Amino acid sequence: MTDRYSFSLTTFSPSGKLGQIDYALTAVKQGVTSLGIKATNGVVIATEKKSSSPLAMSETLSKVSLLTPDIGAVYSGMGPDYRVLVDKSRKVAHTSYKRIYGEYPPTKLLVSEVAKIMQEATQSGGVRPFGVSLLIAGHDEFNGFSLYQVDPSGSYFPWKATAIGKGSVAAKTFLEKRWNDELELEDAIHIALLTLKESVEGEFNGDTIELAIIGDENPDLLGYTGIPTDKGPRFRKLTSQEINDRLEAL
């Protein structure tokens, strides 16, 4: 009685592929257009906000989560897989670093920690592997601003701009052409709305874009108005009005 399932559910096929990773990727291709840009004077990430219903809050909805204070992530794939994964990433990041080295994990180090979760899950049976791909966009004061891709298997590679979801390749073409480093964060926000207007047609607004930047400070993001002791967050998610203001700014 009870489970006995310990046989791996991810297995090799005659070609050298892994059935479960192939499947999972189809889901990711069909998922919501997300991109990431390093502006060099920041990092701007944008993703599609969506609504389920007009009578539905989209405050609760999670399309951009802060993994650690200076770092945000966005994705294309399977929403439920994303939500749990964010949780295990937040937990280990807090317990194992935030009073051990006395600060957040470096971006590359955090990409490896995610990578490991996904790989445990691919090796081991009882459970199928995560079906997701992430774009982890970040700042760490020992590597600047970074952009990574995290694949479903947990393969990762460095990027300085990319897009995943539906309609990626052409989105990368517009981004490649418009930005080539040394660019204001504001300007990268403008370029990003332009790339996505061409990418999404039928109805387009800044109330269907959810935009976050890592690329600012306020005293409010030290979390106190007194005498500094540390630097604190640089994650800031914008409200819908601010985004419409940048849509009005040519």
Binding site: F174, E184, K197, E198, V200, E201, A249, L250
Partner: protein, 326 residues
């Protein structure tokens, strides 16, 4: 005071109380002197916050100046004050540069004056990093030539701009030029050339997201070619599409657009011999609006002059209604 916002209010009061020329003296003095917040950029003033307000003074003068023949002074001022904007951000230069030629063309009255400003904006823009949209401004010059009655000269420029566009991703501009390229062709007597060009504007329009109004405007041209190349039925059907959509826009349709579709709609029926249906448009007021003008009265008069088999009645409308109608 001497700060920018106070000097906006005081100069504005100078227009009302006296004249634009008096206000202009104040505006010039706000550049020349009067210490203002943040870094200088005139040797005494801003030209950032100073420039957003500068859009507003150029505008205030600019409508009157082309009509007045005070044009020359309007013509000088913008070129001198462009080099201010260069000393601020990329975005600031982009926003101001593009506006100015459009501001003038909301109330045009000196085609010449408008042409002259625009050519310096095209040289000036090159000094930043912008060479994408200098052709987009070359459409603005082209519309002015069209109006001068220089179709031949416009033809020679317009094509070259079309070629640039499709490998710089200036795809929203492409719809604009294709429609204009058609108007040029139509006048030169190349009825064939106009349809083909228009079909390209149509492919281009559906490539991208765009306003409701743009889409309907090409369809207005489509129905206009379909009266000159026959098939009054097909002309009917687009003008129908334009008019339904403007009904749902209600009274938020712009004035020229709504009026021109309606002038055309009534006409297409008269040629088609659906005489009864001009009288139905006339009674209807969601499909005619509140509008009465000489045009609407002429169409009613001809369509009726048509039904009775009456030549006297035709001549009568032709003549009273003539300036607007013809």
């Amino acid at each position: 005071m001497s700060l920018p916002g106070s000097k906006l209010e005081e100069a504005r009061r100078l227009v009302n109380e006296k004249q634009y020329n008096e206000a202009e003296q104040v505006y010039l003095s706000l550049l020349d002197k009067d210490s203002s917040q943040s870094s200088a950029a005139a040797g005494a003033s801003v030209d950032d916050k100073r420039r957003n307000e500068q859009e507003t003074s150029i505008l205030e003068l600019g409508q009157l100046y082309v009509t007045m023949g005070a044009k020359d002074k309007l013509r000088e001022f913008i070129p001198h004050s462009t080099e201010y904007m260069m000393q601020f951000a990329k975005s600031k230069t982009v926003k101001v540069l593009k506006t100015l030629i459009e501001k003038f063309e909301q109330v045009p009255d000196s085609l010449d004056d408008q042409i002259f400003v625009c050519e310096k904006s095209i040289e000036f823009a090159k000094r930043e990093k912008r060479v994408f949209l200098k052709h987009s401004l070359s459409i603005k010059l082209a519309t002015l030539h069209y109006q001068k009655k220089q179709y031949k000269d416009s033809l020679a420029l317009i094509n070259d701009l079309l070629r640039e566009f499709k490998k710089l991703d200036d795809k929203p501009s492409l719809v604009d030029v294709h429609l204009l390229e058609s108007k040029v062709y139509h006048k030169l007597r190349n009825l064939a050339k106009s349809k083909a060009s228009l079909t390209a504007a149509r492919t281009a329009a559906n490539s991208i997201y765009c306003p409701t109004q743009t889409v309907a405007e090409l369809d207005l041209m489509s129905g206009i070619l379909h009266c000159e190349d026959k098939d009054y039925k097909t002309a009917f059907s687009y003008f129908f599409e334009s008019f339904e959509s403007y009904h749902n826009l209600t009274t938020h349709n712009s004035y020229e657009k709504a009026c021109q579709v309606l002038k055309y709609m009534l006409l297409s029926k008269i040629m088609l011999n659906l005489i009864d249906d001009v009288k139905n448009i006339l009674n209807a007021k969601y499909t005619k609006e509140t509008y009465q003008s000489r045009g609407i009265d002429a169409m009613k008069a001809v369509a009726e002059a048509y039904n009775n088999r009456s030549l006297l009645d035709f001549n009568t409308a032709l003549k009273q209604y003539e300036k607007e109608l013809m």
